[PDB]
């Protein structure tokens, strides 16, 4: 159930084309795979990688998907964020910024 219409979406988009192709295509294939696993009563068993290398290594070892959590993001900190407990008190950019590193590592591993 959406609490809004197609028109309400379109009127937010402007006229200059954008495309978030990496997220768009990954979301499509990922969802299809999860539906496949659900139908077969099978599952992905994974963990949160703490580095880009861990994420790449996971995929090499055959784990099909990756989790990324706020606990580890809190523990890691950043150049401006002191590490600490899982209070989600980092700026809201914090987990996306950490995820960006993982995505770049994965795309780079594919290119290499």
């Amino acid at each position: 159930i959406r609490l809004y219409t197609a028109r309400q979406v379109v009127e937010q988009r402007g006229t200059i084309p954008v495309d978030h192709i990496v997220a768009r295509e990954a979301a499509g294939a990922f969802y299809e795979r999860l539906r496949e696993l659900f139908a077969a009563r099978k599952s992905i068993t994974t963990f949160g990688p703490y580095s880009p290398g861990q994420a790449v290594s996971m995929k090499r070892m055959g784990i099909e998907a990756i989790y990324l959590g706020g606990w580890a993001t809190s523990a890691k900190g950043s150049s401006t964020e002191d590490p600490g407990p899982d209070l989600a008190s980092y700026p809201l950019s914090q987990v996306p910024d950490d995820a960006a590193v993982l995505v770049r590592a994965l795309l780079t591993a594919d290119r290499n």
Binding site: R41, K42, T45, T46, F47, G48, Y67, W71, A72
Partner: peptide
């Protein structure tokens, strides 16, 4: 245990900060 979760329709199961621990 992971297979048993899958049988119940838990499709995506995760050790949240596993990476932090092994690091």
């Amino acid at each position: 245990f992971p297979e048993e979760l899958g049988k119940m329709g838990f499709v995506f199961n995760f050790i949240t900060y596993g990476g932090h621990q092994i690091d």
